[model samples]
Structure formats: structure tokens, C-alpha cells
Target chain A: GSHMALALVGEKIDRNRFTGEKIENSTFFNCDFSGADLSGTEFIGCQFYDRESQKGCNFSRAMLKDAIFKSCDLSMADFRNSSALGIEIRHCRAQGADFRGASFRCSAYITNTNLSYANFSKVVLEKCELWENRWIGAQVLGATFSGSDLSGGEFSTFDWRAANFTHCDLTNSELGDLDIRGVDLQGVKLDNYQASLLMERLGIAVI
Target chain B: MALALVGEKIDRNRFTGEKIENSTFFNCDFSGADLSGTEFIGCQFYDRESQKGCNFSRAMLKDAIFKSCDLSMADFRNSSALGIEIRHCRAQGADFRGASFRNMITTTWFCSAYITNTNLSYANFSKVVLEKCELWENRWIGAQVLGATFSGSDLSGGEFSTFDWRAANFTHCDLTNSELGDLDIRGVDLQGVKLDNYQASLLMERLGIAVIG
Candidate 1:
């Protein structure tokens, strides 16, 4: 639980209590952390809120494969440039967390959370409720919210061909002045009043 | 020949070749329906209880005429309607998300509608008369309107940046509270687009025109 640094490989820290601990610049390779209490833990990067002279806690290019984080409070955690391939993190809470650049290949589930400008891109979210999140000017491609509810998310500039929002709810969302020339919102559910706002952004003159 | 959909309440109306007069509709989902060859005269689609406006999402309306109808807060999102003639209809705050006018439907007739706070992005239309329509806070960012008439339409607090409105007519249109971005008003036909006196002062400063009083 040192915020300074450490390099522990092939460690079994199952059901551990590491809440609000700063695990900065540490390398934990192939660790088995099933049912762990790593809430509010800062891992991997400074989160770098504003380029702090002393770097914040982070995982720092660590391999977090097959880590089961069932019901963990990962809110405000920093996971920059860490490989957590095929990680099972169900029913987790990550509100206001900074995920600037992280990789979750194959499968990942992070449903229901407030990630407002947490800094994201190239990640897949399943049935997430991301309302009123500030997702502008991050250049984050590869976003798939297939069946999510994005009530009031803000997006300004950048083509979103890589994202798939099939059967999503975008009520009261701001899509005007956005580079949505490549996005697909075909099977989305929208109301009448909200439809007008959505259509006008798509360049259709309503009668 | 006959009144196809005869009822006080109907969901998803698919009436075609029907002549309706003074009919009332409440909470109808037109997304699964099409209004082709239908004539609605003095019809009211006002829903009070639901407060949930009608859903016209991806609807098909072709060769239809709606005269004197109250279609307030209707949804026309991603719908494909060609040859739609809307005359004297109240379509305030309607959603038209990615809805298209597939064919070259011109606004030749002199008709009117409420159509305020509506979305018309990436929606194309031509020669449509928008006389005295409340179109403030409306989105027309990627609109492609050709030979369209906008006489006496309130475009206040509206932003039409990165828009493509070529060969459109903006005669007597009030754009006082709107900011035009990435658009060349000189290219479009703005013979009488109304602007307030205060804006003229701002324009004078930008164009370097002195006031010799």
C-alpha cells in the first residue's frame, strides 16, 4: 500500500482491503484479486488533474489480466496505459474517474456511472447510463454504447465513425455543431420534441 | 372513397387515399404508419393527458396534405417523407432527427406552420413557404434547402454553423437573435432578411463603416 513505488509479480492478494490507497508507479503482473476492496484507489498515472509536480497514484503499465472486481468502488481512480484484457468488473462504480487512455480488449462492462470529462476513448460500454457527461475534444475513438442512455452528453468536433450507439436514448443531448458525419444512430429511441432537435442537427428541414 | 381511420384515439395511423375533415387524433405513433394520398382538413392531434408528443420517428409521408392541424410537439426523426404539404399546422418543438425528404419536394405552395424549436439538420427541402412560423432556437446546421421561402420566420437564438443552405430564399426572415457561422449570406438569396437596428451597429464596426452624425 505504498504510494512511492513497487514491482510485485505473480502475487495472490485475494479479498484484500486497499481502499483510498495510492498505488503509484507499481507493476503487478498476473495478480489474482478476486472480490477485492480497491475503492478510491489511485492506480497507474497522476490522474494528472493539472500536471502535479509529484505524480499521483497509478498502476504504471502494469498487467491486470483476469482481475475480478465485483462491486468495487473505482471512482476517481486513474488507470492510464494499463492492460486489463478480459477483466470482469461487474456492478462497479467509477464516478468522476480519469481514464485518459486505458485498454479493455475483448470484453468489459461499466454500466451506470457519472464519467463527466473523466477523459476517455477506444473503450466499449454496454448499456451505460451516461447522461450529461462532457465528452468534447478528447479525440477518443472506438466507443460503443449499443444500448445506453445518453441524455445530455456534449460532443464538439471529431468524426465518430468508430462509435456504435444502437438503440440508445439521446434526449436533450447536444449534437449540433458536432462532426457526426460518420456516426450511426439508426435504432435509437427518441420522443417527438427531442426528435426535432436531433433531426435539425442531421440537416433535415422539418415540415 | 371513405374515412379509413375513423376514431377518437388511434395509435400509429396508416391512412392512405382518405379524405378527413375536422378529425381529432391523440397520441399516435406515425413511425410505423404512412400518410400517403391523405387529406387532413382542420384536424387536431392535440394530446393533453400524455404530454408525450406524437412519435413520427422514421415515418413515411408522401403526397399528403395537412391543412389547419394542430400537430404540436410532433416527432419526425429520421423519417422519409416526400411531397408533404403542410398548411396552417402547429408543429412546435418537433423532432426531425436525420429525417429526409428523399425526392425533390419543392415548397411551391404558400402554406404556413408553427414549427418552432424544431430540428432540421441534414434534412433537405425546396421552395417551402415558412411564412410567420415560430422557428426560434431551431437547428439548421447541415440543412440543404433550395429555393425555399422564409418570409416572416423567427430564427432568434439559433445557430446555423457548418450549414449548407444554397439557393435558398430568406425574404423578410427575422434573424436578429441568431448567429450565422461558416455561412456566406452573400451567396444565398437574402433580399429582405430582417435584422434589428442594434445588429447594424455591430456590423458597422466589423465592416469599418463610420457613423457621420
Candidate 2:
């Protein structure tokens, strides 16, 4: 079936297989793909605006490189182990989205998303915001968080090696058990209680 | 004691307690002259475009400045200089390397070239502006630059390891991929400087911040 320029609007695709489908330049508006299997779907230059999918819906092991998902609602969708290189998810609602083991090399996320357990290895998060999000077990190696906000976010057990956090705020965030060596601590907003907690974690005996 | 020593190859000429004022030292070579305590008040020692060595060692040079003259291999070692400025002069291999510069302000070093191995250690450059000059691999270790500005100059592969760059500003300049590991970042204010994401990350990373995510 040739799915070129096919507008899949407001359709509920239940357990449908879109494997190896060349869905280029197609618009999927307000569609609900709860539990749909979209493995190996080539969505080049395609738009997935305001689409919602349930948990365990497999976008896993797919190539959605350079795809635009503007204002899409992907709450609790399973994007585990996917390749989303250079994808832009601007102003989207992706709360509780499972991005575990996914790589976002040069990808952009300019909205408030629940990126909890999102593996951001070798990613570039320039001028973005990750406020009040759960970043537990997220590997943020070689990622630049410049001009962004990570406040009120849970970063427990996140690997932050070689990360640049220039001119960003980390206030009201749980940063326990993190090695902040060789990182700038100046101009960062930290409350008195948070400052004491950070100092105690550094093995300093405060009077 | 104004001695008219013209066209004389005077080696190690020692002149002290003598006022050599308003004298023209034309076509004279004083390569190793001991010019100690020689007060040069309103004196035109060398004319414009003259290839000669006029040594001013340990001399009280007040309000004396050089213009379009060759001062190469001339020694000004341990001299107390008050209100001295040099402009548009050829100073290749000229040794002002270890001279003490104090209370110098409103000085300009425009278009004057220096040698690569010249020593500029312990020289104070407070409120000095160096514009469009070639200073390739010059030694500025431990130089006090309180309010010095280096704009529109090529400082590629230049070393500022031992320089006190507190309150110095570098705007619209190319410091890309340069090694500034020896800079004292705690004492310097690097506000409003134009740096890329990687370069700005490196500066913040040195100060204990996770710049990359």
C-alpha cells in the first residue's frame, strides 16, 4: 500500500504493523496509535503533530531521523532503544515517555517533557529546558546543556561526565552522589539549605 | 658637558652627571654605551630614519618619547621611566624586556612590532591599549595588566600562562582553539566576552561545572 501523502488524522491504529513503510512527507494529525507496532518505519520529513500513543507501543528499533513532532502528545509512549538523530520535538507534550537506551545525537527538545530514564549519551541539548523532569538513570555524557534550565529535576544516578552547564540554573534539584569536578559553580543559584547539603556531600565538616 | 662626538664608534661610552640636552646624535653608533644619569630634556638625538643605537640605561627619562627611530639592541635596563611613550618605531630585538614600568597610563602600542623571544616580564600595562600589532610568541609571563585591552590582533598560538588578566576584556577577537590553561580564572572577570559553546564550556568546566550533558 502506497502511504505517500496519506493524511492519517484522528485514526486509532491498534496493533498495526507499519514495518519498512516509506511514509515520507505524510501528516499524522491527532492520531491515537495505542499499542501499534511501528518498527523500521522511515518517516523522512514527515509530521507527527499532536499524536498520542500508549505505553508499550513499539517505536523501538526504528529510524525517525530528522522527523518533526511539533506539539505532539506522546504520553507514556515506548521509544526505548530507538535512533532519533537530529529529530526536533518542539513544544510537544511527552510526559512519562520511555526514552530509555535512545540516542539523540544533535537532536533538539524545546518543551517540557518527562524525559525520565532517557539515555542522552553523546547528545547536544543546546538552549533547551528540562525543568521538573525525572532524569533518573540517564547517561548524559558529552552533552552540552548551555542556556537551559534543569531546576526541580530529579537526576539521581545520572552520569554527567564532560557536560557543559554554562549559565544554567540547578537550584531546587536533587544532585546528591554526583561528582561535580572541574565544573563551574559560580553564578549558580543555590539556597542556604541546598548549599549546606552540597557542602556536606563534599566531605566538608561545616560548623 | 656637551661633547660633539660625531661619526665616532664609541664602545662603552660612559656619561654621568652631564646634561646632554638639545644635542643631535646624528649617524653615531653607541652599541654598548653606559649612558647612566644622562638627562635628555628636549633633545633630538637621532633624526627620522636613522640606523643607530642610542642606549638610555638607568637614565631619568621624564616626558621623553621615541618616534620613527630604530632602537634595536639598545639597553634600557633598570631605568626609572616616568611618562615615556614610543609610537611608530621599529623595535626589532630591542631589549625593553625587563624594564620596570610604573604609573604608566593612556599609553598606546599601535603598529609596533617586537621580537618573538623578547622578555616583557614584570611590566605593568595598566590602562594601555594595544591595537593591530604583531606579537607572535612574545614572553609576557607575570605581566600586570589591570585594564589592558587587546582587540583586533592576531594572538594565535600565543601564551598567556603567567599573565594577571584581571579586569581585561577581549572583544571581537579570535581566541579559537588557543591554550589558556595557565590563566588565573578566579582573579579575572571574563564577562561579556564572545566565545563559542565549546570554548565557553571549557572555561566553565575548569571552574568545576558540568558544561556538557
Candidate 3:
């Protein structure tokens, strides 16, 4: 069904199959889309700002490039294989969101979110508190992380050549093969044993 | 004419035109000896030794090595040395004026004495190692140092403004961060040299090139 230019304001769309739905020029204001499957939806110039949608809102193969998702509740949403380039997601609840193979080029901020398998290459994050998140096989190139607390995070197959952490606390975080040459490392916290190992790799003999 | 003075303790001996072979001089003091035109083959000079004011002019000292020997204030001016290895010897304030060191292999200078205002022009130091030595205000205006390695040595605040350092390896050595635009560095390897990006860019700019990614 063609829902072109439809203004679905304050509508409760629960467990509905809206796959490949044309939502161009539509505004979904305060809509409750709980347990809805929205896979392959074309949201061209559509605004989902300040909406409360959660649980199985599959956004796979969805054209959400250059869309702004602000202050929305999208917990347990499947955003796998989505082309979300240049999208700004701020202050959103995206617990258990599957963002594998998703490219976030411009900017993104997630506070208290479960962002596992989020392929974040060349992404810039600022003041994002990521607790208990899984970053396995995440290709984070040219990414700057600052003022963030990442405690009890599991990171397997993490390449440190393309990542830099500044003013962030990574307590009990397991990492391998880091290169911190000539980087601004002020107020950055690390354990005594970890600091010794890092200094020995830089040709500095510790007594 | 092989003088086998092995393990001998000779002091102030005035001997000339002699050949010293396979001799070991341990803790000996040969001060002010006139042993000119002598040929020393396979001789070893030990530690805490002094050879002050000794005349070894026109001496053929081939294959002879000097280790930890204090040859201070000794004159080795206008001498020809071939295939000689002098390592870890203190030649502080020694006069090596116009000495020729041609065809010498592997001459190492590890924390040795200073060579202040010394004339080392037209000398060949190919395939040699000079680590952590002080060459303060020395003149190497036309020296040939092909494939020589200089590591952890301080050449800073010194006058190397007219020296030709073509094909010299300066890995991890501080060049006073000075501008070496006029120095001949045609075939030198600059890898592992720790220079700031601004200093590295200045060197690249002087060669009519830009350091780009």
C-alpha cells in the first residue's frame, strides 16, 4: 500500500508489516510503533524526530541517509545493512540495536545505548557514554572519542591503528596492538602495568 | 726485523727503525720516546696506557689495534695508516694534524676522546661506526664517509656549516636541528631519524620537493 505524504501523528502502529512502504515527505510525530516491522522502508525526506518507537522496527535496506533521529525511543530496532550516512542520532534510546554494516560518516552520539556490531568507520563521537556495549569487529577509522566512560565493554578483533581515545576512561577494557606515538595524552588514565608496556614499545628503557 | 716484545713492560725506551710484532704492552708508560719510522704489526696496547710525546712519524702500523690507550698530547702528524683498527682509545688533546687514514676497515669510536679543532679533511671513513663521540668544532670540510653509521652522537651547536656529508648515515643522531641545505646528502638514508614534522618539512622543501601523503 502506498502511504505517500501521510502524516501519521500520534498513531499506534503495533506489529504491522510496513515493509518497503513509501514514506516520502511524511511526518511521524509522537507515533507508537511498538513491535512493528519496517524493513526496506523508503523514508525520503521523512522526519521521525521525537517519536516513541521500539521493538523489532527493522530498518534494513532503508534509505535513511541524511535523516535526523532526535530524542526518540527506538529500543531493539534492527538497523542492519542500512545506508545511514551523514545521519545525526542524538539522545536516543537504542538498546539492543543491530547496526552491522552501517556507515556513519558525519557524526553520531549514543548515551547509555547497546551498540553492538556498529561498523563505525570514519565516525566522530563526542561525550557518548557507552556502557556494557559490544564492539567486536568494528572498523573505527579516524574516529575521535572524548569525555566518554566505557566500562565493562567487550571488544574482540579491535584494530587500534585507526582509533584514538582522548580524555576517556577505559577501565578494564581489553585491547591489543595500540600505537600512541606523539599523541596528546593529557589526563588520560591507564594502569601502571599498562603504562609500562606501552613505554617499552616506544624504545624507552625503564629502570 | 720482527721485535717480539710480547707481555713486555718497557718504559721510556728510545728505539728507532724497529719492527714490533705480536707484542702485548699491558699497563705500560712509553712517555717521550723517539721511535720514528717503526713498523708495528699485530701489536696490542692495553688499558691505562700513556704514549705522550712519542714520535711515530712515517710509521707503517698496518693491522695494529689500540684499545683504551691514552695517547694524549702525542703527535701523529703526517702519518700513513692502512687497515688499522683503533677502538675505544682516549686520544684527548692529541695532535693528529694531516694524518691519512686510507683503506681502513671498521674503525669504531664508541664513547672515545674528544677531537676539538682537529683537521680530518680528505679522510675516508667508509663502513665505520662512530657512536656517542664528541666532535666539537672539528673540521671535516672534504671528508669521505661513505656507508658510515653515526648513532646517538651529538653534533649539535657545532660548526658543520662547510662540511660535506654525502652518503653518511645519521640514524638517531641529533644534527643540532640546523639547516643542512648546503650539505651534500645525495645517497644518505633518513629512515629512523627522529625529527619533528616541521624540521622534516624544511629539509624536504630545501630539496625542491614537498612531503605529501
Best prediction by lDDT: 1
- Residues B111-144 of candidate 2 have per-residue lDDT tens digits of 3322232344454445545443444444455656
lDDT of 1 by residue, A1-207 (tens): 456456544455544444446565444444433335444454542122222222223443445554444444454455666665544444444444555455666444443333434556665655655565555554345666666676666655534464776667665656645322334555565444444333344332323
Q: Write the per-residue lDDT of candidate 2 for residues A1-207, one digit (tens) a residue.
A: 376677776666654556446565566665555334444444444555443432323455455555455444444455666666655554455555655556566444444444654555545565555666666665566667765677876667665444666666777788755544445554454444444444344332222
Rank candidates, DockQ, best first: 2, 3, 1
lDDT of 1 by residue, B32-128 (tens): 5667777888876656666655666766666667777766667776665555666556555555545554443365433334444545554554544
Worst 10 residues of 3 chain B by lDDT: B204-213
| Top TM-score hit | 2
* Number of backbone-clashing residue pairs for each candidate, in the order shown: 34, 16, 0
Model 3 per-residue lDDT tens digits across residues A1-207 = 366566766676654445545555566665555334444444555454443442235565455555545445454555665666555454454545556555544344343343544555544554455545556666667766665565456555676556566665555555455444534434455543444344345542222
TM-score quality measure for candidate 3: 0.37
State candidate 1's DockQ.
0.01
Ranking by TM-score: 2, 3, 1
Report the candidate with higher TM-score, 1 versus 3. 3
